[PDB]
Amino acid sequence: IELLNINTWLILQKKILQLCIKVSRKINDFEYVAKFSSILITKYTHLLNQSEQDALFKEYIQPSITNESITSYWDPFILREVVINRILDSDPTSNEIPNPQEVFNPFKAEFTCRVQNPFKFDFTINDIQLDEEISEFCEIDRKAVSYSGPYNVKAESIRSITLPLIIKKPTYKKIYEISCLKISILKLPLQKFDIINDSRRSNPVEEEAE
Amino acid sequence: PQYFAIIGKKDNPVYEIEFTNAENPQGFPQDLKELNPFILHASLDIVEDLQWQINPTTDNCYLGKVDHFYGLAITAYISYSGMKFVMIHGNSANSSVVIDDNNMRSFYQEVHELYVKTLMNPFYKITDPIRSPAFDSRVRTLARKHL
Amino acid sequence: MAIETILVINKSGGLIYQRNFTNDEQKLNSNEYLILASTLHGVFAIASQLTPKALQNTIPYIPYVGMDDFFKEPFTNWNKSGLRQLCTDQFTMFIYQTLTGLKFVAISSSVMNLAIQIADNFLRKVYCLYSDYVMKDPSYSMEMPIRSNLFDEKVKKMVENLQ
Amino acid sequence: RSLKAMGEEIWKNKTEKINTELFTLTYGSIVAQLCQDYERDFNKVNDHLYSMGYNIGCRLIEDFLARTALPRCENLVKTSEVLSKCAFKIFLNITPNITNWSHNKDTFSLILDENPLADFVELPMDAMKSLWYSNILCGVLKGSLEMVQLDCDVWFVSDILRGDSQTEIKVKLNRILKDEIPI
Amino acid sequence: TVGPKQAITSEASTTYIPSRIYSESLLFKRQEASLSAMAFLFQEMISQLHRTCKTAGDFETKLSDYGHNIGIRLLELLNFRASSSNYITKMRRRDLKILDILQFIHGTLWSYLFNHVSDDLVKSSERDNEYMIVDNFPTLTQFIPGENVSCEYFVCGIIKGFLFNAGFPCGVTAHRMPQGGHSQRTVYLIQFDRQVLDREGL
Amino acid sequence: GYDYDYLFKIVLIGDSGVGKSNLLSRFTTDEFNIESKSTIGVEFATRTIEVENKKIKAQIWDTAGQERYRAITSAYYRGAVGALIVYDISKSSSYENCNHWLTELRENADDNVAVGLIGNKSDLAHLRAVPTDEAKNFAMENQMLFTETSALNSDNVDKAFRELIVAIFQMVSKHQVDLSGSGTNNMGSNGAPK
């Protein structure tokens, strides 16, 4: 794997490290079969078929899933954007906060959320089927977290994640930004799966006790 | 069967074809999957070694049979930009490129004219494959009429 | 005939070029040239509007000024109701409007109709050097003084080829 | 004598001469980089080639009027006579003829036979609907004719680079506006 | 859909003759233009590259990229039409020594872009690994006033991409030496890299 | 020599007797060798400031209204890029045609201009013909810089000119990069071979 600059031509790079996966299977090394199964993510874009050795490669993934930590979720491109749209409760309370000289030259958001619930949506990059996720929640933030996680995701589609059902505690109105959440894709909770092409911010403040 | 490929500067391919006789329609039986790109990429290197030799192992464009491996000979052509037109020939018996050596020099020149004709498009960068429907007919009529 | 000072004024009043040729004196401070150029644009406007009971053909020739040359054939002018030539004792001022509106002013220290014929065949040969050496100039924006230094000794050679 | 025969004298002597293949290559380099830095937004590169070409024609009308000394054109059919026989014959080497005036001589069209700016181009498939390659002329003919105070508006309608029938350019001119005080 | 990089398409020989879709030509057909129509497009290169550039050096080395994408086209054309298609020839030498491609660029590239052959080709005698190419009149930069020579580099990128695609990795730099009555003499120095330098020794 | 970089022309326009010429003399170079006003009409005055390490030369052309020169004035707004409508707060009928001056000057000046609006003779503030808040509003929906000049204090009008040349500068500020010219090598004894 040093003779080809892997870490150009592409078919041979796929075929050599497919041989490396099969030799590390017959040896039954685990850390390299995890490593080359994880370094196949430079090339799932081209060169693959729609769920033939994606599933016959998932039978090489899932032994490394059932072992201890030897894969740790290869691709950090999951959730396109997150929307924290407060649902409609009532319009009775928005509960808000508050010539001599002098030349004039014409030439020269944050939320205050209430007791409602957000939205999430994402996609999986490749046609391995029935990828599953549980228990997505925020990072170092306040009480404003979700509860329940029974969801899968389909083959290629950009899938909704319904029912997040946020519950928060009131704070002071110090304006901080969140970006992403702690999402566990059928295994341990990995880190901030950040958004494509921009950080794609969100801006919360306190819950209104007024 | 015949295998033909245009190998770029960084060795990335830009045209990739086989064409074969109708007697064995599924050509290159259990070599096309697993040896046929390896012998090409392995034997780029003697073509690369022959690009700086004045006399071979006063034209320096056509190159002869440069490698012979399991009775498969390959032939090569080093263009002016350095895109090399290496092509593997396969048969039943010992194949001869010497019966076509006067002939298919005008197959390499008549595909180098097509490469020059698809270079002049300013939208065509280097290091991207030839996704041209015109190019396939323009190479396979040349392969049919002149072999 | 002769030329002693090239003045090139804009299509909007104030000048963009002047270069006194062998004047050897500075009667006017540089700032005055701007109010002179705007005064010539104003009287060029005024000399349109007074015209007597007229309301009714400027065809020069090739005299071989400057020593191949720039053109061969008789042509036309473009201004009729407008100032064309002032005449005094010390000097004589020619002026030449282009079609786009770009007047060229040539102050002449050789005094006393054929001077029009020899004059505008020089003032079109300065227009060809303007369109060849100032228009193809990406450092030169529009509506700006001519800060190019190639335009000076491309016209100096032709005027010392004249006189 | 006339405008058909006058421009080839200017084309015959004292026009400084260059090839056209370098001209095609150096246009093609500009439009390829303009594609690659605007992320294939092809209604933006038509705008940018328009805004590039509009600043050519204001510099070009003084060079044309100094190279030959025309009067102002009396009618819009003879603006088209200049743009046939003495505009593109001097600067380029092409004579694109005129067909298809309007019902009242308000528009016209300009059949361009061979283009000296696309000799090699086969444009890509995502640009096959939203790009006009030789848009630079539609910055020039908007530009230079605006300095003669003929406020025209000029677009492409069809071209052979798309795979259509013929390259033609529709000119529709609105007002003569106002001109320098002498006439 | 002819070469995807997903697969090599396997297709049998001796099929039918298909329809004919696009056919071009490649000989020179020496068609002229006016130098004003070249210089207007050259100043419209520079009138945008002045606008989208912050310092001088990145303006230098992205005015050079436009010349790079004429040089890598022109190298394959000029040898192929100088060795002369369906009027079948015997092909050119494919030159591979550094003063056999400098003679080719000196006598044929400048006689192709411009009407005249470039006048001189000067080795740097007091050292090695500099190779001057000069003229007496740069006919594209001749409408630029002043002295700064950044606007030169569109021609020098034509040189550099000529050699970078010829297997000779170099680097050009233009300078101005106003010798004699030629006030715009404008030397380019081609300056080859170190890693090429051993190879022509062996 | 001359050595400035750009040159703008800025018209002063208004009714007659609104006090434009006395406003012009106090804040800028004046009475250099200009013959006078009315002899040819529209006197020219010059002001030289610098913006953003570029030198700017501004020519101010105080238009003269005498009915006789009305045809002549039209041709003088051709190419005019900077503009200043002046009105006086004491008299009131100038403001009735100040909008007419703006309309005539939006016509045939340039593609885009930057028109200021200035209230002369605020020394007679008590004699206010028109309220300043109405003219301030009429400047606000016409994209105009608005000023009130005492005619005894030149600081206000001088500040207005500096900001007007800034807004008209960035409008025409052509991009510039560098003219350093430091790249020198290649001093050999020329073993040439052609």
UniProtKB/Swiss-Prot annotation, chain A:
Part of the multisubunit TRAPP (transport protein particle) II complex composed of BET3, BET5, TRS20, TRS23, TRS31, TRS33, TRS65, TRS120 and TRS130. Interacts directly with TRS65. It comes from the Eukaryota. It is found in: Golgi apparatus, cis-Golgi network. This is Trafficking protein particle complex II-specific subunit 120. Present with 259 molecules/cell in log phase SD medium. It comes from Saccharomyces cerevisiae (strain ATCC 204508 / S288c). The lineage of its organism: Eukaryota, Fungi, Dikarya, Ascomycota, Saccharomycotina. Belongs to the TRS120 family. Specific subunit of the TRAPP II complex, a highly conserved vesicle tethering complex that functions in the late Golgi as a guanine nucleotide exchanger (GEF) for the Golgi YPT1 GTPase. TRS120 plays a role in the YPT GEF activity of TRAPP II in concert with the two other TRAPP II-specific subunits TRS65 and TRS130.
UniProtKB/Swiss-Prot annotation, chain B:
It comes from the Eukaryota. Keywords: Autophagy, Endoplasmic reticulum, ER-Golgi transport, Golgi apparatus, Transport. InterPro entries: Longin-like_dom_sf, Sedlin. Its main location: Golgi. GO terms for biological process: endoplasmic reticulum to Golgi vesicle-mediated transport; intra-Golgi vesicle-mediated transport; macroautophagy; protein-containing complex assembly; retrograde transport, endosome to Golgi. Pfam families: Sedlin_N (PF04628). Disulfide bonds: none annotated. It is found in: Golgi apparatus, cis-Golgi network; Endoplasmic reticulum; Preautophagosomal structure. GO terms for cellular component: cytoplasm; cytosol; endoplasmic reticulum; nucleus; phagophore assembly site; TRAPP complex; TRAPPI protein complex; TRAPPII protein complex. Belongs to the TRAPP small subunits family. Sedlin subfamily. Part of the multisubunit TRAPP (transport protein particle) I complex composed of BET3, BET5, TRS20, TRS23, TRS31 and TRS33. Part of the multisubunit TRAPP (transport protein particle) II complex composed of BET3, BET5, TRS20, TRS23, TRS31, TRS33, TRS65, TRS85, TRS120 and TRS130. Part of the multisubunit TRAPP (transport protein particle) III complex composed of BET3, BET5, TRS20, TRS23, TRS31, TRS33 and TRS85. Present with 1200 molecules/cell in log phase SD medium. This is Trafficking protein particle complex subunit 20. It comes from Saccharomyces cerevisiae (strain ATCC 204508 / S288c) (Baker's yeast).
Swiss-Prot record, chain C:
It is found in: Golgi apparatus, cis-Golgi network; Endoplasmic reticulum; Preautophagosomal structure. One of its GO terms (biological process) is intra-Golgi vesicle-mediated transport. Keywords: Autophagy, Endoplasmic reticulum, ER-Golgi transport, Golgi apparatus, Transport. GO terms for cellular component: cytosol; endoplasmic reticulum; phagophore assembly site; TRAPP complex; TRAPPI protein complex; TRAPPII protein complex; TRAPPIII protein complex. Its main location: Golgi. InterPro entries: Longin-like_dom_sf, TRAPPC. Coiled coil: none annotated. Part of the multisubunit TRAPP (transport protein particle) I complex composed of BET3, BET5, TRS20, TRS23, TRS31 and TRS33. Part of the multisubunit TRAPP (transport protein particle) II complex composed of BET3, BET5, TRS20, TRS23, TRS31, TRS33, TRS65, TRS85, TRS120 and TRS130. Part of the multisubunit TRAPP (transport protein particle) III complex composed of BET3, BET5, TRS20, TRS23, TRS31, TRS33 and TRS85. Component of the TRAPP I, TRAPP II and TRAPP III complexes which act as guanine nucleotide exchange factors (GEF) for YPT1. TRAPP I plays a key role in the late stages of endoplasmic reticulum to Golgi traffic. TRAPP II plays a role in intra-Golgi transport. TRAPP III plays a role in autophagosome formation. Present with 3130 molecules/cell in log phase SD medium. Belongs to the TRAPP small subunits family. TRAPPC4 subfamily.
From Swiss-Prot, chain E:
The keyword Iron does not apply. The keyword Membrane does not apply. GO terms for cellular component: cytosol; endoplasmic reticulum; phagophore assembly site; TRAPPI protein complex; TRAPPII protein complex; TRAPPIII protein complex. GO terms for biological process: endoplasmic reticulum to Golgi vesicle-mediated transport; intra-Golgi vesicle-mediated transport; macroautophagy; retrograde transport, endosome to Golgi. It holds the Pfam family TRAPP. Present with 8350 molecules/cell in log phase SD medium. PANTHER family: 41-2 PROTEIN ANTIGEN-RELATED, TRAFFICKING PROTEIN PARTICLE COMPLEX SUBUNIT 5. Part of the multisubunit TRAPP (transport protein particle) I complex composed of BET3, BET5, TRS20, TRS23, TRS31 and TRS33. Part of the multisubunit TRAPP (transport protein particle) II complex composed of BET3, BET5, TRS20, TRS23, TRS31, TRS33, TRS65, TRS85, TRS120 and TRS130. Part of the multisubunit TRAPP (transport protein particle) III complex composed of BET3, BET5, TRS20, TRS23, TRS31, TRS33 and TRS85. Belongs to the TRAPP small subunits family. BET3 subfamily. Component of the TRAPP I, TRAPP II and TRAPP III complexes which act as guanine nucleotide exchange factors (GEF) for YPT1. TRAPP I plays a key role in the late stages of endoplasmic reticulum to Golgi traffic. TRAPP II plays a role in intra-Golgi transport. TRAPP III plays a role in autophagosome formation.
